[PDB]
Amino acid sequence: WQDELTVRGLVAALLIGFIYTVIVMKIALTTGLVPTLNVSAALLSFLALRGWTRLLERFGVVSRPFTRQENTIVQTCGVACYTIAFAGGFGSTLLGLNKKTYELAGDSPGNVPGSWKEPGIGWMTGFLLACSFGGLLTLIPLRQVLVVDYKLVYPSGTATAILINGFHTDQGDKNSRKQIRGFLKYFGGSFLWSFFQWFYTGGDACGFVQFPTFGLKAWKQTFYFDFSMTYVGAGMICPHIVNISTLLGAIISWGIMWPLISKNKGDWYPAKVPESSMKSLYGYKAFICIALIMGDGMYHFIKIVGITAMSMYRQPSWMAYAGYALFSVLAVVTIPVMFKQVKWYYVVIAYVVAPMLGFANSYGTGLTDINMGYNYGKIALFVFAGWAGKENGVIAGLVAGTLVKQLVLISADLMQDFKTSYLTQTSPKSMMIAQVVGTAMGCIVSPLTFMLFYKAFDIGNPDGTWKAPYALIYRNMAILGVEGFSVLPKYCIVISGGFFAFAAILSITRDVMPHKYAKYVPLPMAMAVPFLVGGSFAIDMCLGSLIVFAWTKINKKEAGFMVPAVASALICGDGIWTFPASILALAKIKPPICMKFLPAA
Amino acid sequence: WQDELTVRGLVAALLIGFIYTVIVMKIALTTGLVPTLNVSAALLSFLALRGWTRLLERFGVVSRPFTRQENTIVQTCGVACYTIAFAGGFGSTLLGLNKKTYELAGDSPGNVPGSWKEPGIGWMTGFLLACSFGGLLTLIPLRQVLVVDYKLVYPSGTATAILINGFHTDQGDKNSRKQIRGFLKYFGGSFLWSFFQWFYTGGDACGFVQFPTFGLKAWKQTFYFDFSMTYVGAGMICPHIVNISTLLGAIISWGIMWPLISKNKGDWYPAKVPESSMKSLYGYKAFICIALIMGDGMYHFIKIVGITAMSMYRQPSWMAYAGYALFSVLAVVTIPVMFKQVKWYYVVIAYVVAPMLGFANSYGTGLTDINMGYNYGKIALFVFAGWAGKENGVIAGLVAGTLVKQLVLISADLMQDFKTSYLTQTSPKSMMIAQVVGTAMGCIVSPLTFMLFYKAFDIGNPDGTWKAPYALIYRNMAILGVEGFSVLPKYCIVISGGFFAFAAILSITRDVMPHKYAKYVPLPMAMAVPFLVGGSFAIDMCLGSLIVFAWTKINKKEAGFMVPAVASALICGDGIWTFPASILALAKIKPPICMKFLPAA
Ligand SMILES: CC(C)CCC[C@@H](C)[C@H]1CC[C@H]2[C@@H]3CC=C4C[C@@H](OC(=O)CCC(=O)O)CC[C@]4(C)[C@H]3CC[C@]12C
Ligand SMILES: CC(C)CCC[C@@H](C)[C@H]1CC[C@H]2[C@@H]3CC=C4C[C@@H](OC(=O)CCC(=O)O)CC[C@]4(C)[C@H]3CC[C@]12C
Ligand SMILES: CC(C)CCC[C@@H](C)[C@H]1CC[C@H]2[C@@H]3CC=C4C[C@@H](OC(=O)CCC(=O)O)CC[C@]4(C)[C@H]3CC[C@]12C
Ligand SMILES: CC(C)CCC[C@@H](C)[C@H]1CC[C@H]2[C@@H]3CC=C4C[C@@H](OC(=O)CCC(=O)O)CC[C@]4(C)[C@H]3CC[C@]12C
Ligand SMILES: O=C(O)[C@H](CCN1CCC[C@H]1C(=O)O)NCC[C@H](O)C(=O)O
Ligand SMILES: O=C(O)[C@H](CCN1CCC[C@H]1C(=O)O)NCC[C@H](O)C(=O)O
Ligand SMILES: [Fe+3]
Ligand SMILES: [Fe+3]
């Protein structure tokens, strides 16, 4: 509980959060493709504190030793600081409320003239403070069930824990240096492989990432193999049933269902509207994907409640939810004050389903390491926009979309650190203090960082440097969302309801049979991840499982303790390169070559 | 001497030679890019004879065991049969004598109307028989000096010998199965890597072979890294001084000399004529390349003669040269009968320099595994065309170009098998019998195979399927060659003479210093190989030396006996795939995808 919270750690976390906020914010306001930087934060937290201790030792100043528990605290505090930068919708949703996006959207029903709000320090900071801490309190009951009871493996959380453990190991065990040397060989190889790939991804859909390994026809169906060691490494430490389910979901959606649905491009949905829109082939993608997750997610949530209810019938869990209710009512009486377009009971509905929605995202992140939190926000934005008419509907959808996205996204990304703390033997009490401190600085720094960018430069211009494409894209969903569920394509609800029931049946089927049949049951929400992303992620995960399957047969003993080290090195090596790659995009240094693939034209 | 020459081996070699002639001839008359198929012949010779013995055992017929010595005989006899198909200039030079190429070349000085000859069984077979056996007799004195005295490593000969040895090993030694399993792991990996590469080389200069590893600017200077395991594997078993010399030659020519010469595209040589022509930047490439080889080649040839002359002064070698003189005078009194355009003393000059020219090619092939025999023919074609005026000059250049090319190319490719026989403990006496028998069938089958293609189809049409581009290209060199050395670009002879002297000085310098300085002297004709081919071959060879250098430091003991096995597997794996790739081109099955690289346009 103590010896892990230090003043130097607070300074280090504050600095790491500040630069990582600037990197995230600048990328968000220029391209909207914010990268994952959690792994890089662990390395920077390690280097900064070891450098400070050595520099003081050089000057003769003695300092307390820097252990792995303190490294986890600094990394966790730093991550929470810059997570608010993109979880708060500064480049997607909150920027969609400005006047510039209102004019670009044009004149249409729902887009009434009173649907713009201007950014400011006073209201952005208060908006974040009220709602950011809501997700933190939900984590405490979720930490027990997911991290250790359900034994969910968080591949990025597990990889970071091994990386942090390898930094602070000092005693010469016989298996330790076999692991450390194995980690270092593949860490350098993966980092150099990612560095080599960068020079050839200099165009739209070209490079080693867009490699048509099984042909150009299968590549267009997203059934290729990108040379991503993050997904290959993640699949190595995931169970085979998770990897098989991921591929099985990609086959059903991209190999069968989407081609069959696309044959009705003129009947079921209009063909003039572009794809990736909620009226054309993306309503199928978004609603079927959540229905698979929600159908599986609800049953486990009811099962936990049902088990808990029976246990107390037979006879700090309520402390966290009491604080959550206190923060819930605080947002209920504050958010409508800032936005008169948002009614009081809109916030109430958002805060009741958030523990239930946050659980599903955390469970899904604990299976496939994919955070779908921003996908929940898109559905909630569409639904909440339909709960209001043309008047006060666009702002209501955007504001309520930020609420659902934050409590869902924050919960899943911050379960990554609890898995890291579990493996590094860090006290959960000290973790939550770093959770609150990191979130508190994030709710202060990010509004300040955004407005410095906002005042100095011009963000939102379609023809310019600081272009925020997702500010207008998120605005259009709310404009499309003011109309009810009628705008969804034909049979969209019927198919979604069928997949909701099908997901529930698998959850029923898995838990009712004996274990010697129950391990062949595919996981419904591991299936749902490739419904939105392509099947390349599924192929990469299965390749990682194939490597472990072959390795175990060849050498059972070595694969027992070397698979986690090799898999973590592959994840960390690609994760570390994400930091220099972001700096290159920060300085506008584009790749020189574009590796295109053509049909022998 | 016996137990290696068998009737079943003769039948197997005759069959393997016949199909390989058809594959070579069809590719020669359609694209002119004849591939290397020596490695594949060893595998097919092994499978055919093992299949025959097992099939007879299944039917109850008992047969003599099939040893590795018999496998070397069959492979050597088969190789000599189909080597004549492309060494005889059936698709480049002999096809340039037909009337179709004469009309396509147009009306120009030197291209007199009496400069066409039509193909036929009677004269093609007699032309080959007179001159093909000339190179065989020169091999006997060359076998002693090059294979074992000079200890030249023939990477394709060494790789084939290890492949043949691994086929016929039966006793469970402790290091044998470590070598066999190491060979098989990299043989399958290299073969599958070559198979994977094929689907993406579906265009002009696109694919993994044309990979700009160091940028597009360096790729245009041929300073990239093609993913060729043949050159990487060849460089592994070559000494470091050979690999370093190869890179050092590529730096001088492509990195320095060619860019400097190209700055005078309007002054030194005319700019209207295209490159790769003897009047524009290719006279520099061709004449400087030979001058480096000839300067080094002459000194070693004089050194052997000087050493031999001193030895006999102090006091079967002459049997081979007595037979060579007998075959030399036979061609002198026969070739001018077929071609009245060729004078008797043209053949005499060709047959005197052929042992001296053949030695240099065999020495160069024993260093870098690159056969430059067809490059000698281009120089001899140009020179002999200049020895005659506009009258009887084009045919004289073409016919004399075939003579010089055959005795030079045959000598170098057939020293590959003598290195194979040396490592497989095959009797040299039985090797020469397979040399003569294989050449005798080659001089019969190839004229017959060519005319069956010639009579049935239409070869030589620029707009058609059976197009022979090199038939017209070789015709144009003779047309350009009737004019003397004045057509060469400015300072072409001066620079060539400077490199001839510079090559000689290194040969002087290497043999005069003590050995503890003599190992740093670059080899002049290992430098000359990247003067015509790009520097990618140099980079691949140096990467192979880097792998061996790192492997030796990490584990001295294992790298001692596993480097030849791994290197041979890389060469054999790419060599084996050359057979199915040729069948795909035989059936006109083109690669589906073309992996292009663009400057981020
Ligand atoms: C033993 C293991 C390592 C096997 C290797 C994987 C194969 C199963 C893959 C690798 C390359 C793949 C091929 C790569 C490219 C194509 C081109 C594709 O043709 C196209 O449609 C390209 C575009 C066009 O031609 O219009 C058809 C599938 C095919 C043959 C793929 C079939 C499956 C292949 C052979
Ligand atoms: C074992 C691990 C490492 C993954 C290997 C998977 C591939 C070898 C196979 C398995 C699933 C196959 C896919 C299954 C389904 C389809 C759907 C099919 O889609 C269509 O029918 C086209 C629809 C249209 O016309 O739009 C094309 C082949 C493809 C992509 C197949 C291509 C090859 C895949 C990716
Ligand atoms: C530790 C080892 C493995 C180092 C890895 C090799 C590097 C030394 C190579 C690999 C990629 C190479 C780069 C690949 C591509 C380019 C693009 C090239 O720019 C171009 O001219 C492309 C065409 C254009 O932009 O017009 C400049 C060199 C550079 C940076 C190359 C510089 C050298 C690099 C970094
Ligand atoms: C260590 C082994 C594995 C090989 C690694 C070699 C590369 C790292 C280096 C060594 C030689 C270098 C080349 C040396 C000379 C040149 C010549 C230079 O040519 C020009 O000046 C351009 C002339 C023009 O404008 O036409 C461009 C850089 C280049 C290709 C360099 C690119 C990078 C190379 C290939
Ligand atoms: O939101 C989006 O769809 C895109 C890409 C998806 N986001 C990028 C990484 C995190 C993810 C997310 O949001 O969780 N981001 C728009 C700008 C910014 O990321 C934001 O959301 O404000
Ligand atoms: O000769 C050439 O320049 C080209 C490519 C080079 N030849 C192909 C492989 C062997 C090499 C050689 O000839 O030794 N071949 C033209 C047709 C045929 O190969 C022939 O030469 O009759
Ligand atoms: Fe986003
Ligand atoms: Fe040729």
Author numbering:
A (entry chain A), B (entry chain B): 45 to 359, 393 to 678
Quote the passages of the study that discuss this structure, keeping the authors' original sentences:
Poaceae species use a unique chelation strategy, whereby plants secrete a high-affinity metal chelator, known as phytosiderophores (mugineic acids), and reabsorb the iron-phytosiderophore complex by the yellow stripe 1/yellow stripe 1-like (YS1/YSL) transporter for efficient uptake of iron from the soil. Here, we present three cryo-electron microscopy structures of barley YS1 (HvYS1) in the apo state, in complex with an iron-phytosiderophore complex, Fe(III)-deoxymugineic acid (Fe(III)–DMA), and in complex with the iron-bound synthetic DMA analog (Fe(III)–PDMA). The structures reveal a homodimeric assembly mediated through an anti-parallel β-sheet interaction with cholesterol hemisuccinate. HvYS1 comprises two distinct domains: a substrate-binding YS core and a scaffold domain, implicating an elevator-like transport.
To overcome these limitations of DMA, proline 2’-deoxymugineic acid (PDMA), a DMA analog, was synthesized by replacing the four-membered azetidine ring with a five-membered ring. PDMA effectively substituted DMA for iron uptake by HvYS1 in the insect-cell assay system, and significantly improved the growth of rice in calcareous soil. In order to verify if PDMA functions in YS1 in the same manner as DMA, we determined the cryo-EM structure of HvYS1 in complex with Fe(III)–PDMA to an overall resolution of 2.9 Å. The HvYS1 structure bound to Fe(III)–PDMA reveals the outward open conformation, nearly identical to the apo and the Fe(III)–DMA bound structures. Fe(III)–PDMA occupies the same binding site as Fe(III)–DMA, demonstrating that PDMA can function as a potent fertilizer in an essentially identical manner to DMA. The carboxyl and amino group moieties of PDMA are recognized by YS1 in the same manner as those of DMA. The five-membered ring of PDMA is well fit with the binding pocket for the four-membered ring without any steric clashes. Our cryo-EM data supports that PDMA activity as a potent fertilizer uses the same mechanism as DMA.
